[PDB]
Amino acid sequence: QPMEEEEVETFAFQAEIAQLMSLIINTFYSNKEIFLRELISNSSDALDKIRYESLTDPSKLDSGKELHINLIPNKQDRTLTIVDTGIGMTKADLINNLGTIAKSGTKAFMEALQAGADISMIGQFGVGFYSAYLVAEKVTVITKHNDDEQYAWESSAGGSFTVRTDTGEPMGRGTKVILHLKEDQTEYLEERRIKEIVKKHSQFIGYPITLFVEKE
Ligand SMILES: Cc1cc(C)c2cc1C(=O)NCCCOc1cccc(c1)Sc1cc-2nc(N)n1
Ligand SMILES: [Mg+2]
Numbered sequence: 565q566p567m568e569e570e571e572v573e574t575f576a577f578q579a580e581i582a583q584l585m586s587l588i589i590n591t592f593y594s595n596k597e598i599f600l601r602e603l604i605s606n607s608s609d610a611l612d613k614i615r616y617e618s619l620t621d622p623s624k625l626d627s628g629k630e631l632h633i634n635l636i637p638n639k640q641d642r643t644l645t646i647v648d649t650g651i652g653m654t655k656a657d658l659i660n661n662l663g664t665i666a667k668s669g670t671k672a673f674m675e676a677l678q679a680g681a682d683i684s685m686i687g688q689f690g691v692g693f694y695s696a697y698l699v700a701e702k703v704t705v706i707t708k709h710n711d712d713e714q715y716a717w718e719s720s721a722g723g724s725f726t727v728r729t730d731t732g733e734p735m736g737r738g739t740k741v742i743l744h745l746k747e748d749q750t751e752y753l754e755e756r757r758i759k760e761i762v763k764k765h766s767q768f769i770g771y772p773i774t775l776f777v778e779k780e
Contacts, residue, residue, distance in 0.1 A: 573727045577663040577719075580670040581694070585721045587674060588697045593683040596749070599699050600758070601765035602692030603646045603741050607633045608769040610650025610739060617651070627710055627737035633773045635762075637753040642745050644699075644752050648771075649738040652709035655727065662705060662717050663725050667691050693741075697721060699752055700743035706730055707739045 577585065611631045618624045628649050636645040653661065669689030676685060686692050696703045705717040714734050719725035743752075751757045755777045762773060 570728060570731070573659075574724055575659065575664055575727065576724055578666045578670075580674070581663055581667060581691075582721075582723045584670050584674055584691060584694055585697055587677055588683070588694055589721055591677075593698060595682060595684050596695075596698040597752075597761045598684045598686070598765065599695040599743075600646070600752070600761050602687050602695045604633060604762070604766045604769055604773070605687060606693060606741075607646060607648035607650055607739070608771060610648055610652070611771050613651040614649070614737070624710060627708075632771050633769075635758060635773060635775045637755070637758065637776075637778070639750075639753050639778065642747075642750065642753070644743045644745060644758075645740055646743075647735075647738065647740045649736065652737050652739055653707040653715070654709045654712035655715050657709065658705070658707055658715050658717055659727060662693075663719070696741065696743055699745055699749040701746050702744035704742040704744070705739065706732060706735065706742070708735045708737050710737060 576582075611633070614624060615631055631649055634645075634647040636647065637643075638645070667690060669691055673681075673686065673689035673691055676689075677683070683695065683698065686695050702718065702720040706714065707717070708714040714730040714732075715727060716730040716732065717725060717727050745752060755775060758775055762775075766773070
């Protein structure tokens with residue numbers, strides 16, 4: 565094929581977010597399973613936004629009426645994907661929410677961690693997404709909002725992330741978090757383990773969750 569050109573935007577994480585990610589990555593914590601509760605909670609919050617917006621404006625559901633969460637483990641590429649049909653993020657929402665803007669709870673949470681707090685407290689500080697780095701070496705976030713095109717955010721930490729127009733499968737609307745799992749965190753690809761953690765932490769979220777299991 566003739567050589568194609570793709571635009572990429574590399575951003576530096578806000579300093580405190582980068583410090584938080586280094587803490588999460590380089591420190592042992594028990595109870596790493598709470599990452600899934602945090603991502604399902606973000607999906608539920610996003611699904612609430614489209615549900616309520618759609619009450620006044622039904623055309624907001626022209627990108628899909630079904631409000632749900634899908635969990636997709638893939639043992640072949642060692643990824644766990646959390647997909648929702650929530651509001652999604654415009655390019656600006658994506659850059660603003662995933663690393664460039666100082667998060668209100670980062671400073672207090674790092675101090676709490678430095679005082680020996682359990683990593684499970686992360687969600688209360690509004691930085692729950694970053695718990696993905698307890699189990700993932702890289703995270704890819706695909707997002708599609710009704711007012712913009714589909715974007716792909718990615719980071720392997722190291723203080724930077726990239727944003728580009730997504731060349732993968734278009735989604736109608738919502739967000740997909742792809743966790744590229746660490747070699748010692750493959751239990752999160754096992755359906756029994758996923759069911760255990762969803763029953764423990766994510767029973768009352770407000771939307772149906774479907775677990776897709778690859779046939780053996
Ligand atoms: C840090 C972060 C990462 C992701 C992938 C999502 C949300 C957040 C976060 O902490 N957001 C703060 C609350 C405002 O959140 C939103 C603002 C605009 C759009 C969205 C969420 S949709 C969304 C964002 C995040 N996760 C999901 N599944 N959906
Ligand atoms: Mg909620």
